[PDB]
């Protein structure tokens with residue numbers, strides 16, 4: 001029974017290596033990673049791989065790994081797939097811990113924009129969780145943390161993390177992680193998966209996929225939001241992605257909004273992430 005080596009980048013940046021039979025479905029590898037992580041609330045998470053075009057794809061747990069990675073290396077990342085709108089309702093602290101690690105990467109990467117004060121507050125909770133109570137011994141007037149807090153670090157930000165860290169004395173790691181999440185969950189791009197697209201007129205837009213629904217980021221002055229309930233049907237054809245928006249009370253017919261994606265694979269990927277979010281956040 002021939003087995004393939006799998007390498008998984010974990011949310012703390014470490015590498016997990018295991019073997020699965022070469023015809024294994026994605027669920028097999030995911031179960032091994034989740035067991036390694038002592039993770040029970042697995043429904044929020046998944047594995048990503050980089051395709052032949054170098055795009056992030058979700059590993060479908062129901063299909064063969066080899067029919068997804070195809071010509072590519074069996075190299076994966078462990079990631080949050082469905083960001084819970086209310087992390088306080090997760091049953092386990094260890095779930096909230098992995099969600100914090102993902103969000104720290106979302107922030108450092110610039111995928112999750114954040115004001116100066118929120119960067120410092122989030123950073124202060126991470127430090128409290130990771131190091132415990134503020135200690136002046138490790139912190140002189142010139143201190144710079146090993147922790148990555150932001151896409152661009154400044155001495156002012158490092159100072160503000162320390163000032164807020166001082167206020168968290170006696171906070172336990174679970175407590176600091178919960179505070180981190182109560183702040184992060186409110187950010188306007190929390191849990192938003194962004195896709196480049198063009199509207200029916202050829203104007204460059206971004207489509208965002210999240211728990212609440214679909215966002216079309218057009219102008220800055222113009223952001224259209226379609227709650228999942230308002231979305232009747234999702235479809236793709238060639239390079240195009242279509243949503244069917246319900247009739248408002250007393251209107252005879254649904255409206256169709258069409259988008260042009262860069263290529264057919266980008267359209268299918270957007271379609272699948274929308275279907276999965278629609279299903280997940282219809283049940284939650």
Ligand SMILES: CC(=O)Nc1ccccc1O
Pocket residue numbers: 210212213214215225226227228
């Ligand atoms: C942006 C926001 O706060 N909520 C939201 C997002 C997408 C669709 C409908 C919505 O209500």
